[PDB]
Amino acid sequence: KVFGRCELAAAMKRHGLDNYRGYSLGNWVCAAKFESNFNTQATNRNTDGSTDYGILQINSRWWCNDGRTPGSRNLCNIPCSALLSSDITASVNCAKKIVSDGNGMNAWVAWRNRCKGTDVQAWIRGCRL
Numbered sequence: 513k514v515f516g517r518c519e520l521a522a523a524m525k526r527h528g529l530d531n532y533r534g535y536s537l538g539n540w541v542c543a544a545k546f547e548s549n550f551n552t553q554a555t556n557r558n559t560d561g562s563t564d565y566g567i568l569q570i571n572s573r574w575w576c577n578d579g580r581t582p583g584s585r586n587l588c589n590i591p592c593s594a595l596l597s598s599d600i601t602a603s604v605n606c607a608k609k610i611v612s613d614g615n616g617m618n619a620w621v622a623w624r625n626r627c628k629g630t631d632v633q634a635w636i637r638g639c640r641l
């Protein structure tokens with residue numbers, strides 16, 4: 513599923529991401545835009561052989577199991593394929609674990625480089641929330 517901006521913001525709010533660990537909703541919407549272009553089915557392979565999955569591009573080295581990243585951990589206890597669903601619940605729940613880990617949203621390279629320190633509220637502007 514490819515989300516619209518306001519549709520995704522509303523889904524994220526319902527799943528408890530607004531101000532989760534101090535990150536306002538616009539941060540999460542901005543991160544999703546630049547990680548996956550709002551596409552739940554996005555995948556990207558990394559040089560170390562791990563793969564990033566889904567709307568928030570969660571990595572198989574630590575967070576999910578895809579059966580092909582030797583010596584990886586599955587800390588979200590899910591198959592990586594679950595992160596590709598039109599239902600964002602699995603992605604959201606795994607993201608909450610990641611952002612609690614110590615490095616905050618800096619775990620997402622696109623967020624650090626394209627969202628951090630910008631007017632992230634613009635991403636939810638005009639949305640009925």
Ligand SMILES: [Yb+3]
Nearest residue numbers: 574613614615
């Ligand atoms: Yb660690």
Ligand SMILES: [Yb+3]
Nearest residue numbers: 612613614615
């Ligand atoms: Yb440590």
